[PDB]
Design an enzyme around this catalytic site. Sequence first.
Site, mmCIF file in Angstrom:
data_model
loop_
_atom_site.group_PDB
_atom_site.id
_atom_site.type_symbol
_atom_site.label_atom_id
_atom_site.label_comp_id
_atom_site.label_asym_id
_atom_site.label_seq_id
_atom_site.Cartn_x
_atom_site.Cartn_y
_atom_site.Cartn_z
ATOM 1 N N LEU F 36 0.832 -1.189 0.000
ATOM 2 C CA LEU F 36 0.000 0.000 0.000
ATOM 3 C C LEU F 36 0.871 1.245 0.000
ATOM 4 O O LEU F 36 2.090 1.182 0.170
ATOM 5 C CB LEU F 36 -0.939 0.007 1.206
ATOM 6 N N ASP F 37 0.226 2.387 -0.190
ATOM 7 C CA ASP F 37 0.896 3.674 -0.242
ATOM 8 C C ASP F 37 0.538 4.496 0.987
ATOM 9 O O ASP F 37 -0.242 4.071 1.844
ATOM 10 C CB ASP F 37 0.528 4.417 -1.524
#
Lengths: 123, 331, 170, 340, 116, 77, 387
Positions: F36-37
Site C-alpha cells: 500500500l501507499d
Amino acid sequence: AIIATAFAETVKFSGSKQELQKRTLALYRQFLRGAPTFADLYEVQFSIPTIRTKIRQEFERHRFVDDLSIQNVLYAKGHMEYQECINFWKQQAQFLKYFPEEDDIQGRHQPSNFVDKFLKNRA
Amino acid sequence: NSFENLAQDVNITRSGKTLIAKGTGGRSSRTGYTATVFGANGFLGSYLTAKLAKHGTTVVVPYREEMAKRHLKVTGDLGVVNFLEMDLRNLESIDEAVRHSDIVVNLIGREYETKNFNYYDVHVEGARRIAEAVKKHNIARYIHVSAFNAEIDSPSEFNHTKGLGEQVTKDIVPWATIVRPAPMFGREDKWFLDRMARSPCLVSANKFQETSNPVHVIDVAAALERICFDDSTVAQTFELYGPQKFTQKQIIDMVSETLRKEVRHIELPKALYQAYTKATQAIWWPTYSPDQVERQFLSQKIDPSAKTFNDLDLTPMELPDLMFKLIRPYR
Amino acid sequence: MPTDFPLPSQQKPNSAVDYTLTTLDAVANWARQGSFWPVTFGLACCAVEMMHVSAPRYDQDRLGIIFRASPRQSDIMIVAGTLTNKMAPVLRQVYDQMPEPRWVISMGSCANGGGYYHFSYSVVRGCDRIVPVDVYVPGCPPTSEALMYGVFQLQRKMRNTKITRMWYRK
Amino acid sequence: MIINIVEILIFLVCVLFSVAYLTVAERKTLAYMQRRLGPNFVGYYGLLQAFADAVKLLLKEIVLPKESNYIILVISPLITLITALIGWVVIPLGPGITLGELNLGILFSLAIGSLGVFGSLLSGWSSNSKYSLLGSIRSTAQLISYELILTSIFIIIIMFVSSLNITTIIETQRVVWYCIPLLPLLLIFFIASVAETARPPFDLTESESELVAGYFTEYSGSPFVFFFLAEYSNIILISAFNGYLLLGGYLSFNYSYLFNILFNDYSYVSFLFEGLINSSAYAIKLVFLMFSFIWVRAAFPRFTYDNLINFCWIILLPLLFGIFLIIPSTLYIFDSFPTL
Amino acid sequence: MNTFIIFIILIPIVGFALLAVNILLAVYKPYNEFNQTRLAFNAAFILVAILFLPFDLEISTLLPYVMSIYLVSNYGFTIVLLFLLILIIGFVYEINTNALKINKHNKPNTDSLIYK
Amino acid sequence: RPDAEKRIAAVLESFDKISNPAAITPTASFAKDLNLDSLDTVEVVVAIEEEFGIEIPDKEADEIKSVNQAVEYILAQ
Amino acid sequence: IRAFTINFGPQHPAAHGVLRLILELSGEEIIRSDPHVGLLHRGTEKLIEYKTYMQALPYFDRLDYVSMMTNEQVFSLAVEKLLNVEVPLRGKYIRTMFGEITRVLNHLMSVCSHAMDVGALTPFLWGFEEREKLMEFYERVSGARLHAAYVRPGGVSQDLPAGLLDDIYMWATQFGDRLDEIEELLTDNRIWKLRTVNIGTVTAQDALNLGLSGPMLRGSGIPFDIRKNAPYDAYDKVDFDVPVGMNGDCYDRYLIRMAEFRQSLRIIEQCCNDMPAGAVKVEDFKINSPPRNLMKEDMEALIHHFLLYTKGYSVPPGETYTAIEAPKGEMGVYVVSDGSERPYKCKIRAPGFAHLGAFDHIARGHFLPDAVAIIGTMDLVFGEVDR
Ligand SMILES: NC(=O)C1=CN([C@@H]2O[C@H](COP(=O)(O)OP(=O)(O)OC[C@H]3O[C@@H](n4cnc5c(N)ncnc54)[C@H](OP(=O)(O)O)[C@@H]3O)[C@@H](O)[C@H]2O)C=CC1
Ligand code: SF4
C-alpha cells in the site's frame, strides 16, 4: 475581525518536506472523513466512493512535485478548497465542476486517430 | 469546446445544400443544420432541442401556445432558436415552417381526444398534412416518431392509429425514417413517474403486470440526435427499448422502496373503471384517458427486425440506477 | 378538419361562445394586468433606478406595481444590474421558486448580452443564459420612463396572453 | 328563515365587501402621506383594485414546500380567516342590532380574539426550517403578551358597566363617553390595538431581510388571500372594539330634539333615518380609526424584539396595575358601584 | 333557525368556497421545485409565555368579580384589593430580578490597561 | 473484541491494489505486506472508523502501520 | 457545536446591494459573522488596464453607484496630480459644487434607505423625491441620469446650460424645509433613539485599526476630513464647518449625516454666489478635446481631436495614490502609469471595503434586528466593495 471561521487556520509554512507531508496526509484524511457530508449537502446524483476516488486521483496528480514551497502553495490551495466544501460556501453548481466526465458520457465521434482530428480540423 | 455532435466539419446535405460548421463547437458557434421540431414544447421536445441547439444548429420551433414556448429560448444562442406559431389545421403555416429546414421531426402525439381533435386527426391525418409539404420541398432527413405497440389492430384506438400514421409516412415521401421508442421516464414525465410519484388512488387494471422496458428520456434525445446527421438511417424502422423488461409491480415497488411510503393500491376491474374516466373529458386540465384504459391490458410488443441503440454506439441506462434521483424531492 | 384556419394572431370572435370566452379572458388578463407583483432582485447601478420608479415622481403604486420581495408571491422578476459568475445559481434558484404564470424582464444593459462587462471573466454574458427573458429594458441607466415603458410593453403582451381562448385550441 | 338569510348576506356585503376597499384605502392614504398618487390606473378613480388583486391571486398556483404538511397549510389560513370573520357577531350597529344578541357579548368578543393567536402560532410550524420556526416563536410571544393588556383593560371598562352584554355598554355610555374621562387609557389601548394586529410599528417579525426570504411562510396562492384578508379583518375588528368599549359606539348626540321637529309619528322612514344616523356615527368613528392605524403605520420605524418585550412587561403593564388600583378606589370613594 | 347559529356554520362553507376555488382554478400543481446540530435560546424567549399564564389567568380570576361588584359593596373591594396587592408584589419579583433581560455579552472591556 | 479482525479483513478486502486478499493476516504490514501507499494508509484507516462510526484523533490515526496496530487500537471504544 | 448559521440575504435583504452574509447566532446574539462579498464582482480592475484613460473614465461611475461624481472626481484628481496639469478656476468650483450636490444625494439616499431598512417608510420616499429633483440637475449638465459622463481627467467635460446656476438656487432655498421636515420624525423619535443609542460602539483606536474614515471616523470623535485636512478644489476657498460625533454609536453616525446636509447646502450658497468666469476645461488641447467650434476651422485642433480619440493622451510614468473624502468615507485610488496611454495598473480603495471588513469586530453580541441598523450606516452599497 479578531476571530476566524470554523475550520480556517492561520497559514504557516512548514520548514521541512516531512512536515508538509504530515499536513497533506492529515488533509486527505479530512477530505475523506468529510466526503459523506458532501453528498448530503451538495445533493449530488452519484455515490460516495466516486467522490473518494476523485479525491485520491487529484492528489495523484500532484504526487511528483519536487519543491518544498510549490507544494506549500499547492497545500494552501487544497486547504482553501476544503474550507469551501466543508461549508455551504460553494454551491452545488460550483461543486459539480469537479466531475465533467462523470455526468455525461461524451458523445459520438470522440477523435482518436489523425483522421478524426483531421475531418473536423482538430475540433 | 468541440464538435461531439458531428462526425466531421463539412457536410453537404442530401438535398445538395452546403453546410460548413465554422468555429469551435460551443454555444456561440454555428453548425449550419436548419432543423425543425414539431411540438417542441412537449416533454421529449425540450430535451431534444436542448441538445440540438447545444451545438448551434438553427432550430425552427413551431409553437401552439404563447406561454410554454418561452422556456426553450435559453438553450440557444442568437438566431439559433426561432419561434413561429401554427395550427395543425392551416396548411400554409406547415408550408411556411419548413421552407429552409434541412432536417425536421414531429413528436406530435396526444394521449386524449379534445373536443376538436381525435386520434385519427392528430396521428394519421396531420402527419399526412405535414409530410406532404415535406415531399413538396425535398426536405432531407425526415424523421417520424410513433409509439411502441404501434399496430394496425383495434384494441387501442391510439395504437390503432399510430400504425396508420406509420403507413402514411411510408406511403408519401417514402424514405422517411420511423422511430418507435419504449415507455419513457424522466424528471416530470407525462404519466409514468409523476403519476406514480403522487397519487390519491393508484388504480389500474391487469393486476400490475404489463411488461416493457422504459428508457430514460435523455438517452432517447441523444439517440435521436445521433440518428439526425449521419447516413445509414434512411427508411429504417427503429425499435428503441430499454436494457431489461419490467413489470408494473416491480416498477412501483422500486419507486416505493426509495420513497419509503405506502403507495396505495386499489386495482379494481374494468367496468366501473371506464365510466369514471368517461366523465373526466369535460374538464380542461388533462386527466387520465378513457383510452389509456385499453393500453393497460397491452404490453411491449417488440419487433425483432429493427435497429437498436447499439446500431449508433449508445448504451442507455437502467431505471434502478436512477430511482434515487428522479423522485428524490418527494422524500 | 379545415385545411385553412385563421392564425391566433388574426382571429376574431364569431361564435357567442367566443364572445363569452374573450370577455372572460379579458377579465383574467385584466386582473393580471392591474395587480402586478415583481420581486426585488436589483443589485447594482441598475437597482437605484428600480427605486427611482418607487420614488414619488414616476409612481408604480398608481400602476399597481409593488415589490413583494418574496418570490413565491411574485408574478415576475426584474433582473436588474450586472450578473456575475458567482451569483448566477442563486438567480436560477430564485427563478425556480416562482409560480407558473410568470415572466421576467431584463432591466439594464448589463443584464442583456453582458453590457459593459461583456469581456470580463467572472460575468454572465447577459441573463439570456439563465432565464427566459421576454422584455428587455435597454439603457445603461435604463430610464424610469423606459422601465415603465418596458412594463407597458409587457402588459400589452399580457393583454395578448390568451389563456382562455386556448382551451378552444385556436 | 327567509328574512335572516338576507340579514346575514347584507352584513357580509357590508363587511367583507368593505375590507377589500380598506386595503385600497391604505394605499391611497400612504400615497398622500408620502406625497404621491394612489392607485389610479385600475378603475375609474382607481378603485376596485383589490378585486384585481384577488382574482389574479386566485389564478396563481398551489406550489407547496416539501417540508410542510399540506393539511396544516390548509388549516391555519382557514382558521385565521374564519376567526377574524366569526368575530363579527356582537359588533353593535345601533341599539341592540347585532347578528345574534346574547347577554355574554364581551366574553365571545374576547375569546375569539384569544383564538386569534392560535393560527399564527400554528402557521410557522409548517415548512419546519429553523428560521421559519423561531420566527413563529418571536411572533407568538408578543402576540400573547399584548393580548394580555388588550384583554386586561376590558375588565376596567366594565367596572363602569358590570354587564357582559355589549350593547348595554353604549346605553350606559349615553351620559358621557369613556375615552374623554379615561384619556391615557385610549393611548395605551391604541398601541395595544396595533400590537395584536400585524402592524409595523410593532411587526418586526415580517422581516424578509432577517429570514431566508421569509415573511411568515411565503406560502402564496389562494392560501395567500386567507391570512391577508384575516389580517385586514383583524384591523377593523379591533377598531370595532375600540369603537364601542372606549369611544362613542353608535352615539353622536341627543337627536330627539331634531326628530320631534321632523317626524310626527313612528314610521319605517323614521326607523330608516335613525338607524342611518346611528350606523353613521359608528361608521365615522370606525373610519377615523382605520385611518389612524395607517397614520401611525407611516410615521414610525419598527422595533427590536428586546424593545418589544421591554415594551410589554416593564413600561406598560405596571401602569396597568396602577389603573387597577385607582379605578376601584375611585369607585370606592363615592358610592358609585354599577349595577347590571 | 336563529341567524346566530347560522353565522358560525355558514362561514366555514364560505371558506370552503374560497378554498376549493384555487383547486378548481389552478394548474401545474407541483413541479420539481444544512441543519445538522444546534438550536439557540435565552430564558427571555421561553419565559414570556410561561410567566404569561398566571397573568392571563388572573384576568379570568378577576372576571367574576367585575360582574358582581355592586353586591360586594365596600368588602369584596377589600378582599379583591388584598388579592391584587398579593399579585402585584408577585409581579415586582421579576422586574427586580430582571427576568426578561436578554443582556448582551458585547462588553466594552471595563478592565483598564494595568501594565508591568 | 472477537471476530473484529474478521470485519477489518472484510473492509480491507474491498479495495484494489492488493496482490493477495489471502495475504490478510493479523500481522499484515500496510506498506510492506499489503503493498500500500501513504494515501492507502489513511484510506483504510478512515474506512475502519467509518465501519465502526467511531472517530479517532490524528496521531493515533497516523501511527497505525499494520493491522496488528489496528486491532491494538480497536478496543478504545 | 456551531450555531445554526444562516444566509442573510440572497436577493433583497438590504436594499441596493446583494448582502450574502454568514451569521452565527447563539442567543439571537452574533458571536461571529462572515460576510461573503463577491456577488457583484464584475472584475473591473482587469478591464481598466486594457482601455485608455480617455475611455477608462465611466468604469468609475459604475463603481459606488449612489455617489458617481466623487468617483469621477477622485480619478480625475489622481490623473491631474499624475499629469502635472491644473484645472482652471471655473472648473475647480464647478467640480466642487457637483461633488457636494452628490454628497447631498448620497446622504439623501443613504439615510432614507437605512430608515426603510429599519422600517421608517416616509423618508424613503420623501428623500428619493428630492433625489429626482437632483437627477434633473445631473441631466442638464451631462448625460442622462445617475451615470454622468463627466469630470474628465483634464478637468470638466463641458460647461453648464445657460441657466442652471440660477435654477439650482430656486431649488436650494426649499431644500432646507424639505430636510428639516424629515429631521422632525427621526431625530428625537424614542423608537429610533432606542434602536440607535449605543448600538455598534466604535472606539477611537479601534476605528483607526480598522482603517475607517469619513462620517464613521468623524463620528467616533477624531476630527479628520480630507476637505479640510489635505484640501483641494477651493474647499479652501469656501467656508465650511465640519460635524464631529461624541460616542462610537450609530447615533452619531446618523447625526453627522443629518448635519452634512446643512453643511453642503452652505457650500451651494457660497458657490452660486461666487462662480467665476473662465475656461471650463483645461487650457490646452493636449489632454482633452478642443471645442467643436474651432476644430472645423483649425488644422491643429483636428490632429489633437483625432489622437485623443484613437491613441489618447500620453501620461508620464509614475504612480500616485490620491484619496478624497467621498460621502461614504475616504475613497482612494492608486494608479500605476506605464508611461503608455493605458494605465498599467489601477487599484481602487472603495470606502465600504474596510467598512465591510470591520463588520464582525463591531457586530459581536448585538441582536439580529440590531444586525440591520449596523448595515446601512456603514453604507454597504456593494457596488463599492467588490469590483
Ligand atoms: N412514454 C411516452 O409518453 C411515449 C410517447 N411517444 C410519443 O413521443 C412524442 C413526445 O412524447 P411526450 O413528450 O411524452 O408527449 P408530448 O407532451 O410531447 O405531446 C404533445 C406535444 O405535441 C403537441 N401536440 C399535440 N397535438 C397537437 C396539435 N393539434 N397541434 C399542435 N401541437 C400538438 C403538443 O402541443 P403543445 O406544446 O401546445 O402542448 C405538444 O407539443 C409523442 O408524439 C408521443 O406520442 C412515443 C413512445 C412513448
Ligand atoms: S445597466 Fe448600466 S448601471 Fe446597470 S449593471 Fe449594466 S452597466 Fe451597470
